[PDB]
Ligand binder design. Structure first.
Ligand SMILES: Nc1ncnc2c1ncn2[C@@H]1O[C@H](COP(=O)(O)OP(=O)(O)O)[C@@H](O)[C@H]1O
Ligand SMILES: Nc1ncnc2c1ncn2[C@@H]1O[C@H](COP(=O)(O)OP(=O)(O)O)[C@@H](O)[C@H]1O
Lengths: 186, 299, 175, 62, 62
């Protein structure tokens, strides 16, 4: 599990602006606010040398194309795509794993993302963020904030693999049909 | 709570916010975006406009979001646009941040009868909450009717707030009979008042005094003097009581444009502890008995 | 998304309990009322009573008559109060029995004195209104600028209206 | 947005003792601060112990 | 052929509805894996059939 995690491997990121703009325009009509926002992100990341992964949360009615645009952004920016569902989720272990001393412990699902993606800077998509319950024994919102924490992500560690892992270049995305029920700290 | 001592870290005024932005936030965001100082120019006038119109709150993070947005847009226009160095001017600002949301407005500039401002120390900073009063059922229940004007408080009343409102109503009745016995409108008329929430329960009674004066206005229909605020607590006798968190209410009043702030006499010293630069342009008042307020608000 | 919810009101018990009876017109609110919704409805009721007093003191129907109103659910709690403005005019219409001018959508927040306040999600409501075919949309003056951010092609065919004091609305709904 | 945690971080730097932020608001189970009995499969110590371990110092600024 | 889909309780320690959503997912099924055999397996061609006595109690995402 440990040696299967990519280390120092950074998938090449596209820097051409016209090519990315055309790619995005050929995938989703209109929606020009998101397109211009991502264009501005690409430009600023290119100007400031290395590319950082900043978080943003799309929100609107359902079926509008929020997952499809996430996939289109992943394709256009040239980085790896991955989807993840958190709506109504209660067992933080799915994101943290287990102590590894169990008879059949597993690591968090984010380490599975890193392993399958084979890259340390993929595009992780979070789905139905506002549906988190944070109920009894759960409260995955704390770990989720840890993921979005601008600095702790650079040294995030899971219970199974406790070695800190950098998550600054990962480009998180969140989707929710309403901004009310989402916790304020998030 | 009793296991430690508490210092009051509180927000910054428009001038302090502008200084914070220009000297610390702007270079920090510029470095976090990589743009050169000469390449991107942000005049202090643009920062002042942004603070005044867009980011209005005790906190500062929103101004950080706005400056990040404009810097990102400048980087976008530099990398592939036409200008090698974006000169952010107010006229251009409209395109970068869009049209100004949170446009400056006092909720009631006229302040018709039965409504008045009040500096409420809310959970996040302080606000200039508007207490409203209005007749809700005809005074002519019966030409000979002696039924009292039962009041219907609203705005997520707290039992403490209910008792404070009842005390304020009783004191207002007593004052009205003391001044003009002939007048009996408030004595026998059902009146509905609304006190906007957001004020922490501890500061809830701090607006009670306002209630009183509002009712008095509705009694005589005289609008309170323009851009006048006040706060404190009454003890059924007009003896105003001190209130806490004066700095946040003062800064909120300064931002709202209200010029006259009336405070309990005891709080006077606490108001002078505040920095001088925050107290310019306001005609502060200090009182202990409510009577004086009635004269000032209704000359 | 956005929806065109039909707020409605009607008499639910005779106004003539007694020709001399001065009992107030207690209001019953349904539609899975929320505490904030209940308080907003009470505020709207009081403001409607005061407005009818100021305009036509002769009429006292709304003053003394038990009225039931239905506000269909679906609105999220945060924007729940936004429908309150409609409630007001509804009662006023029921007070005079004059039907509101056809295909006239509106929304806003009343503050017990008529000074309307801004509301959120303006774009969703605008698109829903366009889908419903309504032609006149009455919105708070504060939100005016926000409605102009909408792409051009979505705003055709509607006579938008901007207002801050509810008085203006009463002059548009009831000519 | 006043920088209370920011001034705390600045004080930690100036005082030269190690810094560490802690968010207790909304925490429901005390076991996070107290860990577990260590006999349960997966039992782990309190979060303050982890803070001490990571900080590498016995006098940090929690 | 799944049977009595709407009767799923999705209760404590369980929530098999998430596993169903994974299975019925048009694309994730193409690389579905179990805890025993973790090797991904393709399930794009399998034609699932769901039977329920009513459409209400069934989960909306399902
Ligand atoms: N430009 C577009 N305009 C409208 N719909 C689109 C566009 N591009 C893709 N879609 C549709 O959007 C759907 C995806 O819905 P989505 O908004 O991702 O749901 P969710 O709210 O669960 O994320 C797809 O079925 C696709 O057909
Ligand atoms: N006086 C100041 N000068 C410069 N920057 C400040 C000042 N006060 C606050 N900030 C900045 O604004 C942000 C405020 O966040 P903060 O108030 O610490 O969060 P919280 O409200 O959760 O404690 C900080 O990132 C800090 O850098």
């Amino acid at each position: 599990w440990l040696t299967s995690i990519p280390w120092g491997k950074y998938s090449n990121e596209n820097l051409d602006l016209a090519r990315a703009q055309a790619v995005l325009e050929e995938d989703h009509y209109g929606m020009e606010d998101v397109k211009k926002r991502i264009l501005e992100f690409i430009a600023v990341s290119q100007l400031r040398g290395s590319t950082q992964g900043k978080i943003l949360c799309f929100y609107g009615p359902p079926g509008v194309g929020k997952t499809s645009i996430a996939r289109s952004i992943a394709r256009a920016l040239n980085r790896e795509y991955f989807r993840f569902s958190v709506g109504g989720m209660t067992d933080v272990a799915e994101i943290k794993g287990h102590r590894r001393t169990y008879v059949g412990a597993m690591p968090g699902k984010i380490i599975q993302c890193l392993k399958k993606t084979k890259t340390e800077n993929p595009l992780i998509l979070i789905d139905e963020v506002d549906k988190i319950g944070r109920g009894y024994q759960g409260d995955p919102s704390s770990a989720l904030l840890e993921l979005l924490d601008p600095e702790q992500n650079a040294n995030f560690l899971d219970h199974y693999l406790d070695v800190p892992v950098d998550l600054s270049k990962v480009l998180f995305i969140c989707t929710a049909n309403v901004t009310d029920t989402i916790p304020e700290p998030l | 709570r009793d296991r430690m001592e508490m210092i009051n870290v509180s927000g910054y005024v428009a001038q302090e916010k502008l200084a914070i932005a220009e000297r610390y936030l702007v270079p920090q965001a510029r470095a976090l975006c990589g743009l050169d100082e000469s390449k991107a120019k942000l005049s202090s006038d643009v920062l002042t406009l942004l603070i005044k119109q867009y980011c209005r709150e005790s906190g500062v993070r929103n101004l950080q979001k706005q400056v990040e947005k404009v810097l990102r847009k400048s980087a976008y226009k530099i990398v592939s646009g036409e200008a090698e160095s974006v000169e952010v001017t107010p006229e251009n600002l409209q395109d970068f941040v869009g049209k100004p949301v949170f446009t400056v407005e006092r909720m009631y500039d006229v302040t018709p009868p039965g409504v008045v401002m009040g500096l409420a120390w809310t959970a996040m900073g302080g606000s200039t909450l508007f207490v409203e009063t209005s007749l809700r059922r005809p005074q002519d229940k019966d030409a000979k009717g002696d039924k009292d004007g039962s009041l219907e408080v609203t705005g997520q009343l707290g039992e403490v707030m209910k008792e404070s409102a009842r005390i304020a109503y009783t004191f207002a009745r007593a004052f009205l009979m003391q001044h003009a016995p002939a007048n009996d409108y408030l004595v026998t008329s059902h009146i509905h008042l609304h006190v906007p929430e957001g004020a922490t329960p501890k500061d809830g009674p701090s607006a009670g005094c306002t209630i009183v004066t509002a009712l008095l206005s509705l009694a005589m229909g005289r609008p309170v003097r323009q851009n006048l605020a006040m706060t404190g607590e009454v003890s059924l006798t007009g003896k105003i009581l001190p209130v806490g968190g004066i700095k946040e209410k003062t800064i909120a009043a300064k931002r709202a444009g209200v010029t006259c702030i009336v405070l309990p006499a005891e709080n006077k010293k606490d108001f002078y502890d505040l920095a001088a630069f925050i107290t310019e342009g306001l005609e502060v008042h200090f009182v202990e008995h409510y009577r004086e307020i009635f004269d000032i608000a209704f000359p």
